[PDB]
């Protein structure tokens, strides 16, 4: 008996301050570093392993980013902007 | 086994009435020796009748008194059926032993075991003026190997202890001495220790030790002793290597590790008197024997037989042989049954027919 009493529900995390900004910037930098080498006429291709058993061997930035599953919300925002760049103009995905 | 007492003891019956029957079988074995199955069967039959008697509406006190009256009448009837027996009538004793052995596995070896039992009982008691038999005077020795046909009635004594004095066996005209002290370095009951502060003392220690041992052995030998039995010792060495070497040098059979509880039987059989101090070890305390020889049982072991003794004692030893151990134990039990039959024939010298005749006469 005597269950614990608390304001917010269980497993509700919260981080604040300089740590959040540093983490967001680091996540964005990591996302950029993933496809940093896929830019230019001398870019080299990457071989992606699809969850359903397929293989995506591509050089496009948007395909590589959309083949990657991430947890940090900043990385999700970066993947989203890559998709929007792909949909709006058709290229520039790895530059943005 | 076929013995009723052994069967009842070996199996744990777990029920109070059955445990009572087991104790009853023990009591019958103590008093009579055989008939142990019969008493249990009789008790079971009596209680089986009692169940119907109780169902008929009879209190279990009229039943008890009536059973007592019937028991008294039955004792009278059995005594009326009796027949006087004399211990000098060997045929009756042989018939009783054969009847006792008829129900056992050694029934085939009856023409050998029955006279053995009769002679064993007759050789440990006085046929005139004897009211009981001490079966502890008839030692039973079980040795594996051979068949039941190899059972023996050694008139002297047999010892399972091996002769330490290897190389000397079969002493003829033996003069056996049984000592209870130890042939080793001197030692007092008090805490004792020898202090050495000089090499001359270091040599003198073992020089005087060997002198003491040699003096002990010389004192033993001077009495004419040639077979020596040494009682088992724990606190100090009963026989040292030096003492054994000295005794072997003087041609004396040495036999150590004699059990304390066997001293009475050995002394009664041979006629020796135990010696606990060398000062009292004299020739008059030795047991003269015709032959003390260590024999082997065709590679199945070794036995030490001392057969033929001046002024023979009132004891006998039976050696039991067999192919396997189980038949040896059952043969021992059967021989014990025969000995107990002859014993309970010594006291209350009366004889009746068997074969269910007393029971049917009782019933009628």
């Amino acid at each position: 008996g005597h269950r614990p009493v608390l304001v917010l529900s269980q497993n509700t995390k919260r981080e604040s301050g300089r740590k959040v900004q540093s983490g967001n910037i680091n996540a964005a930098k990591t996302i950029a570093d993933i496809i940093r080498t896929c830019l230019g006429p001398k870019s080299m291709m990457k071989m992606l392993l699809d969850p359903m058993g397929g293989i995506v061997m591509t050089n496009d930035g948007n395909a590589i980013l959309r083949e990657i599953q991430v947890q940090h919300p900043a990385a999700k925002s970066m993947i989203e902007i890559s998709r929007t760049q792909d949909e709006e103009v058709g290229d520039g995905t790895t530059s943005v | 086994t076929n013995d009723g007492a052994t069967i009842l003891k070996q199996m744990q019956v777990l029920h109070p009435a059955a445990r009572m029957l087991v104790e009853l079988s023990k009591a019958q074995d103590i008093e009579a020796g055989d008939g142990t199955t019969s008493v249990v069967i009789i008790a079971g039959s009596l209680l089986d009748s009692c169940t119907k008697l109780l169902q008929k509406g009879i209190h279990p006190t009229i039943i008890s008194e009536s059973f007592q009256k019937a028991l008294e009448k039955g004792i009278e009837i059995l005594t009326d059926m009796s027949r006087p027996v004399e211990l000098s009538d060997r045929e009756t004793l042989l018939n009783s032993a054969t009847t006792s052995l008829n129900s056992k596995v050694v029934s085939q070896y009856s023409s050998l075991l029955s006279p053995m039992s009769v002679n064993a009982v007759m050789k440990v008691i006085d046929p005139a003026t004897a009211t009981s038999v001490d079966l502890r005077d008839i030692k039973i020795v079980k040795k594996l190997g051979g068949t039941i046909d190899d059972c023996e009635l050694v008139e002297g004594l047999v010892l399972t202890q091996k002769v330490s004095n290897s190389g000397i066996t079969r002493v003829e005209k033996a003069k056996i001495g049984l000592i209870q002290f130890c042939l080793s370095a001197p030692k007092t009951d008090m805490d004792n220790q020898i202090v050495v502060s000089d090499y001359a003392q270091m040599d003198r220690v073992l020089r005087e030790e060997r002198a003491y041992i040699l003096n002990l052995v010389k004192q033993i030998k001077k009495t004419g002793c040639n077979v020596l039995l040494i009682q088992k010792s724990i606190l100090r060495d009963a026989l040292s290597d030096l003492a054994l070497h000295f005794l072997n040098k003087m041609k004396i059979m040495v036999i150590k590790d004699i059990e304390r509880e066997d001293i009475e039987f050995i002394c009664k059989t041979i006629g020796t008197k135990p010696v606990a101090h060398i000062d009292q070890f004299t020739a008059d305390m030795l047991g003269s024997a015709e032959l003390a020889e260590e024999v082997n049982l065709n590679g199945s072991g070794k036995l030490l037989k001392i057969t033929g003794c001046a002024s023979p004692g009132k004891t006998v030893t039976i050696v039991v042989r067999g192919s396997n151990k189980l038949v040896i134990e059952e043969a021992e039990r059967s021989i014990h049954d025969a000995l107990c039959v002859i014993r309970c024939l010594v006291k209350k010298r009366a004889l009746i027919a068997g074969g269910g005749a007393p029971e049917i006469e009782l019933a009628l």
Partner: protein, 77 residues
């Protein structure tokens, strides 16, 4: 447990008053950093990766999982 014999927990007086004030202060501190021109937005992750970047107090308080009654009072306010 006691003479009242109620299947539950009971808090009375300063304890419950402090609990209510603590819950209200927690709710206030959740959104206190998102006030005025120098305020900053927040990310809210919906346990399945859904992200809500918001500055509105109502959105933050509705999306949160709130258990204390006073905190619920402030959220519905």
């Amino acid at each position: 447990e006691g003479p009242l014999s109620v299947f539950g927990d009971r808090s009375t007086g300063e304890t419950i008053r402090s609990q209510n004030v603590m819950a209200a202060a927690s709710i206030a501190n959740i959104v206190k950093s998102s006030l005025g021109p120098v305020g900053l937005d927040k990310m809210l992750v919906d346990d399945i990766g859904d992200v809500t970047i918001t500055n509105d107090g109502a959105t933050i308080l509705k999306l949160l999982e709130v258990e204390h009654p006073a905190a619920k009072v402030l959220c519905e306010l």
